[PDB]
Design an enzyme around this catalytic site. Structure first.
Site, PDB file in Angstrom:
ATOM      1  N   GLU A   1      -6.751 -47.654 -46.551  1.00 17.74           N
ATOM      2  CA  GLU A   1      -7.997 -48.912 -47.150  1.00 17.74           C
ATOM      3  C   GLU A   1      -7.478 -50.435 -46.832  1.00 17.74           C
ATOM      4  O   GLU A   1      -6.906 -50.224 -46.715  1.00 17.74           O
ATOM      5  CB  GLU A   1      -6.799 -48.781 -48.653  1.00 17.74           C
ATOM      6  CG  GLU A   1      -7.125 -49.151 -50.003  1.00 17.74           C
ATOM      7  CD  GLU A   1      -8.644 -49.397 -50.364  1.00 17.74           C
ATOM      8  OE1 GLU A   1      -9.456 -48.418 -49.845  1.00 17.74           O
ATOM      9  OE2 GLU A   1      -9.383 -50.382 -50.667  1.00 17.74           O
TER      10      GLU A   1
ATOM     11  N   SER B   1     -13.907 -48.210 -56.320  1.00 20.81           N
ATOM     12  CA  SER B   1     -14.933 -48.695 -57.346  1.00 20.81           C
ATOM     13  C   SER B   1     -14.707 -48.557 -58.802  1.00 20.81           C
ATOM     14  O   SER B   1     -15.532 -48.436 -60.158  1.00 20.81           O
ATOM     15  CB  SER B   1     -16.751 -48.216 -57.865  1.00 20.81           C
ATOM     16  OG  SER B   1     -16.979 -49.587 -56.174  1.00 20.81           O
TER      17      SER B   1
ATOM     18  N   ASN C   1     -14.948 -50.686 -62.308  1.00 17.69           N
ATOM     19  CA  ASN C   1     -16.369 -49.591 -63.472  1.00 17.69           C
ATOM     20  C   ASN C   1     -16.511 -49.013 -64.261  1.00 17.69           C
ATOM     21  O   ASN C   1     -14.980 -49.653 -65.903  1.00 17.69           O
ATOM     22  CB  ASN C   1     -16.859 -48.471 -63.004  1.00 17.69           C
ATOM     23  CG  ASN C   1     -16.027 -47.631 -62.798  1.00 17.69           C
ATOM     24  OD1 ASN C   1     -15.386 -46.930 -64.150  1.00 17.69           O
ATOM     25  ND2 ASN C   1     -16.805 -46.182 -61.949  1.00 17.69           N
ATOM     26  N   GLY C   2     -16.840 -48.923 -66.149  1.00 24.68           N
ATOM     27  CA  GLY C   2     -17.260 -49.370 -67.117  1.00 24.68           C
ATOM     28  C   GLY C   2     -17.142 -47.746 -67.408  1.00 24.68           C
ATOM     29  O   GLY C   2     -16.506 -47.999 -68.767  1.00 24.68           O
TER      30      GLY C   2
ATOM     31  N   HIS D   1     -25.270 -47.991 -57.740  1.00 22.04           N
ATOM     32  CA  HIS D   1     -24.817 -47.008 -57.570  1.00 22.04           C
ATOM     33  C   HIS D   1     -25.759 -46.048 -56.648  1.00 22.04           C
ATOM     34  O   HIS D   1     -26.307 -45.141 -56.550  1.00 22.04           O
ATOM     35  CB  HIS D   1     -25.736 -46.195 -58.861  1.00 22.04           C
ATOM     36  CG  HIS D   1     -24.771 -45.584 -60.085  1.00 22.04           C
ATOM     37  ND1 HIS D   1     -25.922 -44.995 -61.073  1.00 22.04           N
ATOM     38  CD2 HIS D   1     -23.357 -46.026 -60.515  1.00 22.04           C
ATOM     39  CE1 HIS D   1     -24.664 -44.580 -62.000  1.00 22.04           C
ATOM     40  NE2 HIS D   1     -23.036 -45.258 -61.460  1.00 22.04           N
TER      41      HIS D   1
ATOM     42  N   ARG E   1     -19.825 -32.266 -42.943  1.00 21.53           N
ATOM     43  CA  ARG E   1     -20.047 -32.416 -41.348  1.00 21.53           C
ATOM     44  C   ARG E   1     -21.164 -33.124 -40.243  1.00 21.53           C
ATOM     45  O   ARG E   1     -22.258 -33.176 -40.688  1.00 21.53           O
ATOM     46  CB  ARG E   1     -19.335 -31.297 -40.602  1.00 21.53           C
ATOM     47  CG  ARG E   1     -18.298 -30.842 -40.708  1.00 21.53           C
ATOM     48  CD  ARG E   1     -18.221 -29.138 -40.238  1.00 21.53           C
ATOM     49  NE  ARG E   1     -19.101 -28.004 -40.731  1.00 21.53           N
ATOM     50  CZ  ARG E   1     -19.049 -26.887 -40.635  1.00 21.53           C
ATOM     51  NH1 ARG E   1     -18.079 -25.950 -40.039  1.00 21.53           N
ATOM     52  NH2 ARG E   1     -19.717 -26.231 -41.049  1.00 21.53           N
ATOM     53  N   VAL E   2     -20.939 -34.075 -39.612  1.00 17.24           N
ATOM     54  CA  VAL E   2     -21.880 -34.946 -39.113  1.00 17.24           C
ATOM     55  C   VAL E   2     -22.568 -34.437 -38.169  1.00 17.24           C
ATOM     56  O   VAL E   2     -21.151 -33.908 -37.503  1.00 17.24           O
ATOM     57  CB  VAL E   2     -20.860 -36.377 -38.352  1.00 17.24           C
ATOM     58  CG1 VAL E   2     -21.965 -37.080 -37.469  1.00 17.24           C
ATOM     59  CG2 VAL E   2     -20.784 -37.188 -39.343  1.00 17.24           C
TER      60      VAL E   2
ATOM     61  N   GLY F   1     -20.189 -41.234 -51.513  1.00 13.68           N
ATOM     62  CA  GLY F   1     -21.075 -41.799 -52.640  1.00 13.68           C
ATOM     63  C   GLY F   1     -22.172 -41.591 -50.671  1.00 13.68           C
ATOM     64  O   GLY F   1     -23.482 -41.838 -51.361  1.00 13.68           O
TER      65      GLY F   1
END
Ligand SMILES: *[C@@H]1O[C@H](CO)[C@@H](O[C@@H]2O[C@H](CO)[C@@H](O[C@@H]3O[C@H](CO)[C@@H](O)[C@H](O[C@H]4O[C@H](CO)[C@@H](O)[C@H](O)[C@@H]4O[C@H]4O[C@H](CO)[C@@H](O)[C@H](O)[C@@H]4O)[C@@H]3O)[C@H](O)[C@H]2NC(C)=O)[C@H](O)[C@H]1NC(C)=O
Ligand code: FAD
Ligand code: NAG
Ligand code: NAG
Ligand code: NAG
Length: 581
Positions: free
Chosen positions: A48, A101, A105-106, A514, A535-536, A547
């Site tokens: 991270e 996020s 966020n809200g 978003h 999977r790519v 996302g």
């Protein structure tokens, strides 16, 4: 404590080998890491860029302080290119730290329309991705609390069938402890006068009308961010390792076989300060929709026409970074009388005809006749590469609107002293992109272009919805509380027509933060980047799980679907793990 268990020294992981490497410690990355380490034999390393922030104080922990953290080191603040709609650059708020996020966020917790998720299987060919399956995983994730008498009295309604009570993510009514504002019931009354439904539970599969909703927070009102929900309870597991403060720059690929294989990642903070870590099984990208595609491109997975000029050898040619879909937000704010004091949020999920009103016939005319012209224009702008496949996405959206009557716009209401609406067109027809501009990952030099308002219906729909917010603020029962508009206020005549609003909106909007779609989950022939198990295409042992993969937008706040998505993908990874023994 958790802080002491987190790794910060690059030399503590450098050269080691783990089963799975997760790039990014956000919503999907931490949900996946916790899920995968339930099996004591599987070792996971999370990398991270940020650090632990969940117990910082009210700036993170109180949802009512929403927005205060923006511009800090917990906000990546990604800059867009200079936008064509207004010649200005915009900032994309995005959490930087464990929990991603969900830290900033809200907290709004709602679900999309059943037909939207079903189209992932029927239109986009993603076997197994339908409402029934996704909703089941959504319920599994959820740990909801029903509202009390005071909350019900304010306007809450909770259908117990539509919420999980045994899951992991604590959700319940936000309650600051003061009285609830009567403006929420006044808004409900005003929309009821026009034949719009009120109080439907927005977690049930038909988000329409005006309702209040749960929030991701504990009963003591502390934010339920992903690190608090999924990492805090499980941090002592010895097979779960978390490295903080470092950026994943690219995927390490071996090309000494028929098909390229991901064997690890290169991480660091600068071009002169990089380290490698290896994966026995797979590398999972969960760095967010603005970043995961760039990690692929740095690694030689993307379009040759983008990569070649940068001095990067294209290993796999895929349409990485196209199909970016984000929404636009504008604000309508009014002063209220003292009688309206009190806390409370609500939202109107409005259909296409509710949004356009008497302009509905004309808006429908555009929807029916320009789809092909719109697809050609978006392709010429670099938002997508195949006109036919894009036309299919547009026909799918037309179906949702004309046959399923899904919510097209969202009018989100905030009270606590004013009547403030943030409004957004939920279903944009524009398509943008994100591509790297340099070969060095640690330079963070990239072009992020959502192409806001370069599709005419997006502009018309946003202006219509924002004009509707002004209209409903001084209508029916709301007239008792209205004490004068402050925004736009003097910046746009109060009687402005629709064309006036369309001229004002490009100069007074913000991203909705978003963005989805930059590594779209759809068949390779439809312009897809990943298959139905994330999977790519054309690479072994590499998935994109965040996302970036939803091929479409949805009529809701996305946390309920993204938590479900990670759980469903983690099950698929667990099966493949048993297959590769
Ligand atoms: C974002 O920024 C970009 C630029 O970086 C904007 O795009 C540029 O927009 C300008 C227009 O504002 C445009 O310039 C025109 O180019 C035309 C040729 O294609 C010219 O014909 C035109 O000249 C006329 O207007 C000038 C400005 O007043 C005069 O000085 C000039 O003599 C000309 O005047 C005649 O015509 C005008 C009407 O055109 C008339 O009123 C007069 O009486 C007279 O008869 C301009 O020079 C650029 O071509 C655009 N592109 C680029 C790359 O520069 C874009 O609009 C911005 N976006 C937003 C939303 O603001
Ligand atoms: C301001 C705002 C408000 C929102 N409000 C709502 C809401 O009210 N309700 C709702 O449901 N949803 C909302 N969302 C959206 C929701 O928070 C996100 O869609 C969700 O967190 C996305 O999950 P993710 O796993 O894809 O990415 P993220 O959660 O963003 O996580 C990605 C992670 O990757 C890390 N990272 C980035 N680059 C690298 C790199 N090179 N190497 C390693 N790690 C890296 C980031 O620091 C981050 O932790 C909002 C989002 C924002 C920004
Ligand atoms: C609750 O939601 C379910 C959908 O699962 C629906 O069948 C039912 O009518 C809803 N309302 C009540 C009162 O239960
Ligand atoms: C929406 O408006 C169009 C045009 O008036 C109409 O044809 C359609 O039936 C309306 N209602 C719904 C629910 O679609
Ligand atoms: C373009 O997309 C269409 C529709 O999905 C597909 O049939 C076609 O093969 C795609 N074209 C190319 C060249 O990829």
């Amino acid at each position: 404590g958790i802080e002491a268990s987190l790794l910060t020294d690059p030399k503590d992981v450098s050269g080691r080998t783990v089963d799975y490497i997760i790039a990014g410690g956000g919503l999907t990355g931490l949900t996946t890491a916790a899920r995968l380490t339930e099996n004591p034999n599987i070792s996971v390393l999370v990398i991270e860029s940020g650090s632990y922030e969940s117990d910082r104080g009210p700036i993170i922990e109180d949802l009512n302080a929403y927005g205060d953290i923006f511009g800090s080191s917990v906000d990546h603040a990604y800059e867009t290119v200079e936008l064509a709609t207004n010649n200005q650059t915009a900032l994309i708020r995005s959490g930087n730290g464990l929990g991603g996020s969900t830290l900033v966020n809200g907290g709004t917790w709602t679900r999309p329309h059943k037909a939207q998720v079903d189209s992932w299987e029927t239109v986009f060919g993603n076997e197994g991705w339908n409402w029934d399956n996704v909703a089941a995983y959504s319920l599994q994730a959820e740990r909801a609390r029903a509202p009390n008498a005071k909350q019900i009295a304010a306007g809450h309604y909770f259908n117990a069938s539509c919420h999980g009570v045994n899951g992991t993510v604590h959700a319940g009514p936000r309650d600051t402890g003061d009285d609830y504002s009567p403006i929420v019931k006044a808004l409900m009354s005003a929309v009821e006068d026009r034949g719009v439904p009120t109080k439907k539970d927005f977690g049930c599969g038909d988000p329409h009308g005006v309702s209040m909703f749960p929030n991701t927070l504990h009963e003591d009102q502390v934010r339920s961010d992903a690190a608090r929900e999924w990492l805090l309870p499980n941090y002592q597991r010895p097979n779960l390792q978390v490295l903080t403060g470092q950026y994943v720059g690219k995927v390490l690929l071996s090309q000494n076989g028929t098909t390229p294989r991901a064997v690890g990642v290169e991480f660091g903070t600068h071009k002169g300060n990089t380290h490698n870590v290896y994966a026995k099984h797979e590398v999972l990208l969960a760095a967010g929709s603005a970043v995961s595609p760039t990690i692929l491109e740095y690694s030689g997975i993307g379009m040759k026409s983008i990569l070649e000029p940068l001095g990067i050898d294209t290993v796999v040619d895929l349409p990485v970074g196209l199909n970016l879909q984000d929404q636009t937000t504008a604000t309508v704010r009014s002063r209220i009388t003292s009688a309206g004091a009190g806390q409370g949020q609500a939202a109107w999920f409005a259909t296409f005809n509710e949004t356009f009103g008497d302009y509905s016939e004309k808006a429908h005319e555009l929807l029916n006749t320009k789809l092909e012209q719109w697809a050609e224009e978006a392709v010429a702008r670099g938002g997508f590469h195949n006109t036919t496949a894009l036309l299919i996405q547009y026909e799918n959206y037309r179906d949702w609107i004309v046959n399923h009557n899904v919510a097209y716009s969202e009018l989100f209401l905030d009270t606590a002293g004013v009547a403030s609406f943030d409004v957004w067109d939920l279903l944009p027809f524009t398509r943008g992109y994100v591509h790297i501009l340099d070969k060095d990952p640690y330079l963070h030099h990239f072009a992020y272009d959502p192409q806001y308002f370069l599709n005419e219906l997006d502009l018309l729909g946003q202006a219509a919805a924002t004009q509707l917010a002004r209209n409903i603020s001084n209508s029916g029962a709301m007239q008792t509380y209205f004490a004068g508009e402050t925004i736009p206020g003097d910046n746009l005549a109060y009687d402005a027509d629709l064309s006036a609003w369309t001229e004002y909106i490009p100069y007074h909007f913000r991203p909705n933060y978003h963005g989805v779609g930059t590594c779209s989950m759809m068949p390779k022939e439809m312009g897809g980047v990943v298959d139905n198990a994330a999977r790519v295409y054309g690479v072994q042992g590499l998935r994109v799980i965040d996302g970036s993969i939803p091929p479409t937008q949805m009529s809701s706040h996305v946390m309920t679907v993204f938590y479900a998505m990670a759980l469903k993908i983690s099950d698929a990874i667990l099966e493949d793990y048993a297959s590769m023994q």
